[PDB]
Design an enzyme around this catalytic site. Sequence first.
Site, PDB file in Angstrom:
ATOM      1  N   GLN A   1      33.085  42.906 -10.236  1.00  0.00           N
ATOM      2  CA  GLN A   1      31.801  43.149 -10.868  1.00  0.00           C
ATOM      3  C   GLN A   1      31.350  44.611 -10.777  1.00  0.00           C
ATOM      4  O   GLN A   1      30.459  45.015 -11.489  1.00  0.00           O
ATOM      5  CB  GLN A   1      30.740  42.221 -10.255  1.00  0.00           C
ATOM      6  CG  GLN A   1      30.345  42.578  -8.837  1.00  0.00           C
ATOM      7  CD  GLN A   1      29.397  41.548  -8.253  1.00  0.00           C
ATOM      8  OE1 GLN A   1      29.799  40.449  -7.906  1.00  0.00           O
ATOM      9  NE2 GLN A   1      28.135  41.899  -8.154  1.00  0.00           N
TER      10      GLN A   1
ATOM     11  N   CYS B   1      27.052  39.000 -10.223  1.00  0.00           N
ATOM     12  CA  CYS B   1      27.766  37.915  -9.539  1.00  0.00           C
ATOM     13  C   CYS B   1      27.621  36.567 -10.241  1.00  0.00           C
ATOM     14  O   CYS B   1      28.619  35.833 -10.407  1.00  0.00           O
ATOM     15  CB  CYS B   1      27.324  37.794  -8.077  1.00  0.00           C
ATOM     16  SG  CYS B   1      25.539  37.426  -7.887  1.00  0.00           S
TER      17      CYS B   1
ATOM     18  N   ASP C   1      23.113  28.504 -13.820  1.00  0.00           N
ATOM     19  CA  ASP C   1      22.578  27.512 -14.750  1.00  0.00           C
ATOM     20  C   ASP C   1      21.948  28.170 -15.976  1.00  0.00           C
ATOM     21  O   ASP C   1      22.030  27.628 -17.079  1.00  0.00           O
ATOM     22  CB  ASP C   1      21.577  26.580 -14.083  1.00  0.00           C
ATOM     23  CG  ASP C   1      22.237  25.558 -13.185  1.00  0.00           C
ATOM     24  OD1 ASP C   1      23.479  25.457 -13.192  1.00  0.00           O
ATOM     25  OD2 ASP C   1      21.494  24.819 -12.491  1.00  0.00           O
TER      26      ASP C   1
ATOM     27  N   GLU D   1      23.662  46.400 -21.667  1.00  0.00           N
ATOM     28  CA  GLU D   1      23.425  47.015 -22.960  1.00  0.00           C
ATOM     29  C   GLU D   1      23.003  45.990 -24.012  1.00  0.00           C
ATOM     30  O   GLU D   1      22.675  44.855 -23.666  1.00  0.00           O
ATOM     31  CB  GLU D   1      24.632  47.864 -23.372  1.00  0.00           C
ATOM     32  CG  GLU D   1      24.769  49.149 -22.494  1.00  0.00           C
ATOM     33  CD  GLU D   1      25.865  50.095 -22.940  1.00  0.00           C
ATOM     34  OE1 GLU D   1      26.622  50.583 -22.072  1.00  0.00           O
ATOM     35  OE2 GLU D   1      25.970  50.361 -24.150  1.00  0.00           O
TER      36      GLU D   1
ATOM     37  N   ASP E   1      23.754  19.743 -11.948  1.00  0.00           N
ATOM     38  CA  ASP E   1      23.439  20.211 -10.596  1.00  0.00           C
ATOM     39  C   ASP E   1      23.886  19.164  -9.572  1.00  0.00           C
ATOM     40  O   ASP E   1      23.504  17.983  -9.651  1.00  0.00           O
ATOM     41  CB  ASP E   1      21.931  20.430 -10.439  1.00  0.00           C
ATOM     42  CG  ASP E   1      21.458  21.680 -11.123  1.00  0.00           C
ATOM     43  OD1 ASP E   1      22.280  22.602 -11.339  1.00  0.00           O
ATOM     44  OD2 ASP E   1      20.249  21.750 -11.436  1.00  0.00           O
TER      45      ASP E   1
ATOM     46  N   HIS F   1      25.133  39.677   4.816  1.00  0.00           N
ATOM     47  CA  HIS F   1      25.445  40.144   6.161  1.00  0.00           C
ATOM     48  C   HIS F   1      26.658  41.032   6.094  1.00  0.00           C
ATOM     49  O   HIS F   1      27.558  40.838   5.268  1.00  0.00           O
ATOM     50  CB  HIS F   1      25.735  38.979   7.093  1.00  0.00           C
ATOM     51  CG  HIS F   1      24.579  38.055   7.246  1.00  0.00           C
ATOM     52  ND1 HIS F   1      24.375  36.973   6.414  1.00  0.00           N
ATOM     53  CD2 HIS F   1      23.543  38.069   8.115  1.00  0.00           C
ATOM     54  CE1 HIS F   1      23.255  36.367   6.760  1.00  0.00           C
ATOM     55  NE2 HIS F   1      22.736  37.006   7.794  1.00  0.00           N
TER      56      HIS F   1
ATOM     57  N   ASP G   1      18.426  30.384   1.942  1.00  0.00           N
ATOM     58  CA  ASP G   1      18.191  31.664   1.277  1.00  0.00           C
ATOM     59  C   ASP G   1      19.540  32.254   0.894  1.00  0.00           C
ATOM     60  O   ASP G   1      20.211  32.891   1.721  1.00  0.00           O
ATOM     61  CB  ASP G   1      17.453  32.634   2.216  1.00  0.00           C
ATOM     62  CG  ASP G   1      16.123  32.086   2.707  1.00  0.00           C
ATOM     63  OD1 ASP G   1      15.598  31.127   2.108  1.00  0.00           O
ATOM     64  OD2 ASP G   1      15.616  32.617   3.721  1.00  0.00           O
TER      65      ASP G   1
ATOM     66  N   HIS H   1      24.032  35.262  -3.579  1.00  0.00           N
ATOM     67  CA  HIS H   1      25.308  35.671  -4.185  1.00  0.00           C
ATOM     68  C   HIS H   1      26.016  34.478  -4.839  1.00  0.00           C
ATOM     69  O   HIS H   1      26.352  33.506  -4.153  1.00  0.00           O
ATOM     70  CB  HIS H   1      26.172  36.362  -3.112  1.00  0.00           C
ATOM     71  CG  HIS H   1      27.430  36.976  -3.646  1.00  0.00           C
ATOM     72  ND1 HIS H   1      27.432  37.891  -4.677  1.00  0.00           N
ATOM     73  CD2 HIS H   1      28.724  36.811  -3.284  1.00  0.00           C
ATOM     74  CE1 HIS H   1      28.678  38.254  -4.939  1.00  0.00           C
ATOM     75  NE2 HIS H   1      29.479  37.618  -4.104  1.00  0.00           N
TER      76      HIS H   1
ATOM     77  N   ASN I   1      35.600  35.246  -4.979  1.00  0.00           N
ATOM     78  CA  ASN I   1      34.559  36.251  -5.108  1.00  0.00           C
ATOM     79  C   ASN I   1      34.836  37.130  -6.350  1.00  0.00           C
ATOM     80  O   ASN I   1      35.875  36.954  -7.036  1.00  0.00           O
ATOM     81  CB  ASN I   1      34.472  37.050  -3.790  1.00  0.00           C
ATOM     82  CG  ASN I   1      33.157  37.815  -3.627  1.00  0.00           C
ATOM     83  OD1 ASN I   1      32.245  37.726  -4.437  1.00  0.00           O
ATOM     84  ND2 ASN I   1      33.066  38.573  -2.532  1.00  0.00           N
TER      85      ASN I   1
HETATM   86  C1  LIG Z   1      24.779  39.074  -7.629  1.00  0.00           C
HETATM   87  N1  LIG Z   1      25.532  40.142  -7.824  1.00  0.00           N
HETATM   88  C2  LIG Z   1      23.382  39.129  -7.192  1.00  0.00           C
HETATM   89  N2  LIG Z   1      22.795  37.860  -6.913  1.00  0.00           N
HETATM   90  C3  LIG Z   1      22.123  37.129  -7.893  1.00  0.00           C
HETATM   91  O1  LIG Z   1      22.024  37.444  -9.107  1.00  0.00           O
HETATM   92  C4  LIG Z   1      21.449  35.831  -7.371  1.00  0.00           C
HETATM   93  C5  LIG Z   1      22.532  34.737  -7.212  1.00  0.00           C
HETATM   94  C6  LIG Z   1      21.995  33.388  -6.864  1.00  0.00           C
HETATM   95  C7  LIG Z   1      21.124  33.231  -5.797  1.00  0.00           C
HETATM   96  C8  LIG Z   1      20.589  31.978  -5.468  1.00  0.00           C
HETATM   97  C9  LIG Z   1      20.949  30.876  -6.237  1.00  0.00           C
HETATM   98  O2  LIG Z   1      20.460  29.598  -5.946  1.00  0.00           O
HETATM   99  C10 LIG Z   1      19.130  29.560  -5.398  1.00  0.00           C
HETATM  100  C11 LIG Z   1      18.184  30.103  -6.414  1.00  0.00           C
HETATM  101  C12 LIG Z   1      17.517  31.233  -6.151  1.00  0.00           C
HETATM  102  C13 LIG Z   1      16.576  31.904  -7.089  1.00  0.00           C
HETATM  103  O3  LIG Z   1      17.188  33.222  -7.228  1.00  0.00           O
HETATM  104  C14 LIG Z   1      17.125  33.810  -8.465  1.00  0.00           C
HETATM  105  C15 LIG Z   1      18.067  34.816  -8.725  1.00  0.00           C
HETATM  106  C16 LIG Z   1      18.061  35.436  -9.981  1.00  0.00           C
HETATM  107  C17 LIG Z   1      17.129  35.049 -10.953  1.00  0.00           C
HETATM  108  C18 LIG Z   1      16.205  34.035 -10.683  1.00  0.00           C
HETATM  109  C19 LIG Z   1      16.188  33.413  -9.437  1.00  0.00           C
HETATM  110  C20 LIG Z   1      19.084  35.280  -7.740  1.00  0.00           C
HETATM  111  O4  LIG Z   1      18.845  35.577  -6.560  1.00  0.00           O
HETATM  112  N3  LIG Z   1      20.362  35.402  -8.202  1.00  0.00           N
HETATM  113  C21 LIG Z   1      21.832  31.032  -7.309  1.00  0.00           C
HETATM  114 CL1  LIG Z   1      22.264  29.652  -8.215  1.00  0.00          CL
HETATM  115  C22 LIG Z   1      22.348  32.293  -7.647  1.00  0.00           C
HETATM  116  C23 LIG Z   1      22.517  40.244  -7.799  1.00  0.00           C
HETATM  117  C24 LIG Z   1      22.936  40.346  -6.380  1.00  0.00           C
END
Ligand SMILES: *C(#N)C1([N]C(=O)[C]2[C]C3=[C][C]=C(O[C]/[C]=[C]/[C]OC4=C([C]=[C][C]=[C]4)C(=O)[N]2)C(Cl)=[C]3)[C][C]1
Length: 217
Positions: free
Chosen positions: A19, A25, A71, A96, A114, A140, A160, A163, A184
Amino acid sequence: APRSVDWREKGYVTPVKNQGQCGSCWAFSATGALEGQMFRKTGRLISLSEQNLVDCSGPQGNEGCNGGLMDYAFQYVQDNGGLDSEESYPYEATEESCKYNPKYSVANDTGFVDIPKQEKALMKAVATVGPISVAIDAGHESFLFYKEGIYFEPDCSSEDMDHGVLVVGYGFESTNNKYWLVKNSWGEEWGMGGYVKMAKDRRNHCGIASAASYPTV
Ligand SMILES: *C(#N)C1([N]C(=O)[C]2[C]C3=[C][C]=C(O[C]/[C]=[C]/[C]OC4=C([C]=[C][C]=[C]4)C(=O)[N]2)C(Cl)=[C]3)[C][C]1
């Protein structure tokens, strides 16, 4: 469920991608899961465009190189009626203008599922569906500098996650020995050829079962 599963040797998984310096990610996780489900359907493995997702899936709730959800990517593909191949719409690691061209679509989806937030449910899904999009707590230094072995970080959160990655299988070390096989998007130099063995059945370590899903095709 079987004692171990690996979809990599069954034709479901493209080579490891990178990436780079873009928060995409979620796009790599989503294309991985769609690559697997398209292969399940057609018997053809075709690398899909992350860039198409970064550029075009804003309306579904994604934030381009700032981040996104798998999703929301699957929803974009459904709404859009398609997704371009990697070859036709190459990866630039920057956001872009949308340049989607339906002539070059090679994938579609009809929604997403889900998975219930339990490792046993994630195991059943991996065993019966194929590669699964998941989110983990990768925030981490132990993860950043991971090289080999079964990753276990005592300070990991199960709630929490930050990624998006792709579960391609699971197994156990016959010689705290179970693991998820995780692809990854940090290139082949990171971890084990770009893969990490994540601790399995250790209380949903790093939240791997907390945000798991796959596209329907
Ligand atoms: C990568 N590179 C990056 N990361 C994300 O883009 C991140 C991935 C993620 C985190 C958490 C979850 O599931 C729990 C949902 C959390 C809500 O987090 C949201 C993110 C982005 C938009 C809206 C909500 C987010 O943290 N995304 C998933 Cl499924 C995916 C950029 C560092």
